[PDB]
Write an enzyme that holds these catalytic residues in place. Sequence first.
Site, PDB file in Angstrom:
ATOM      1  N   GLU A  35       1.017  -2.703   7.033  1.00  0.00           N
ATOM      2  CA  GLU A  35       2.127  -2.044   7.657  1.00  0.00           C
ATOM      3  C   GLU A  35       1.784  -1.339   8.943  1.00  0.00           C
ATOM      4  OE1 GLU A  35       5.069  -2.712   7.059  1.00  0.00           O
ATOM      5  OE2 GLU A  35       5.122  -3.313   4.978  1.00  0.00           O
ATOM      6  N   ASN A  46      13.513  -2.054  14.925  1.00  0.00           N
ATOM      7  CA  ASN A  46      14.152  -3.277  14.450  1.00  0.00           C
ATOM      8  C   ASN A  46      15.476  -3.432  15.248  1.00  0.00           C
ATOM      9  OD1 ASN A  46      11.966  -3.454  12.607  1.00  0.00           O
ATOM     10  ND2 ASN A  46      13.032  -1.949  11.350  1.00  0.00           N
ATOM     11  N   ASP A  49      18.804  -4.620  13.299  1.00  0.00           N
ATOM     12  CA  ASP A  49      19.781  -3.784  12.571  1.00  0.00           C
ATOM     13  C   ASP A  49      19.817  -2.322  13.009  1.00  0.00           C
ATOM     14  OD1 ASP A  49      17.521  -2.714  11.516  1.00  0.00           O
ATOM     15  OD2 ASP A  49      18.240  -2.890   9.458  1.00  0.00           O
ATOM     16  N   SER A  51      17.510   0.013  12.973  1.00  0.00           N
ATOM     17  CA  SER A  51      16.780   0.988  12.119  1.00  0.00           C
ATOM     18  C   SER A  51      15.371   1.067  12.700  1.00  0.00           C
ATOM     19  CB  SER A  51      16.817   0.474  10.675  1.00  0.00           C
ATOM     20  OG  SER A  51      15.971  -0.681  10.578  1.00  0.00           O
ATOM     21  N   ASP A  53      11.120   1.882  11.470  1.00  0.00           N
ATOM     22  CA  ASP A  53      10.079   2.013  10.433  1.00  0.00           C
ATOM     23  C   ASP A  53       9.114   3.139  10.869  1.00  0.00           C
ATOM     24  OD1 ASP A  53      11.031  -0.198   8.960  1.00  0.00           O
ATOM     25  OD2 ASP A  53       9.898  -1.508  10.352  1.00  0.00           O
ATOM     26  N   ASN A  60      11.481   2.787   6.284  1.00  0.00           N
ATOM     27  CA  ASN A  60      12.713   2.510   7.044  1.00  0.00           C
ATOM     28  C   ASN A  60      13.759   3.601   7.037  1.00  0.00           C
ATOM     29  OD1 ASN A  60      15.451   0.823   7.235  1.00  0.00           O
ATOM     30  ND2 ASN A  60      13.899   0.015   8.688  1.00  0.00           N
TER      31      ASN A  60
END
Length: 130
Positions: A35, A46, A49, A51, A53, A60
């Site tokens: 990650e 992202n 959408d 959002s 991380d 998220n």
Amino acid sequence: KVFERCELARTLKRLGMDGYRGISLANWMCLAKWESGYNTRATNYNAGDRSTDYGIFQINSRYWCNDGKTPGAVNACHLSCSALLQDNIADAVACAKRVVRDPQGIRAWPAWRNRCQNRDVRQYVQGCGV
């Protein structure tokens, strides 16, 4: 902060991640590795959408922390997303624990399936004294 492999292994054990909701420490190490490369400052937008991380576990903003800018989001960990960018990972760990309390468990992170599931993950903790 960018943790060293064994330093994080030891920290996570102490924070009680070993076997949490059936997930071994080696699994958590494998996740953090893919990650963020063990980086607490890591962020990923992202565009898809809207959002983002956050942190070592790339948690998220749509469901786990509040960043205010994610449309139609929830904050299940009851934290500012900012909290997941600190060098101390206690909030990040508490949140990660909250994520696996949902039915999906560790499968909540697609990269765990791609990179850690059904693999020999012993490598992530060998010689750390955990």
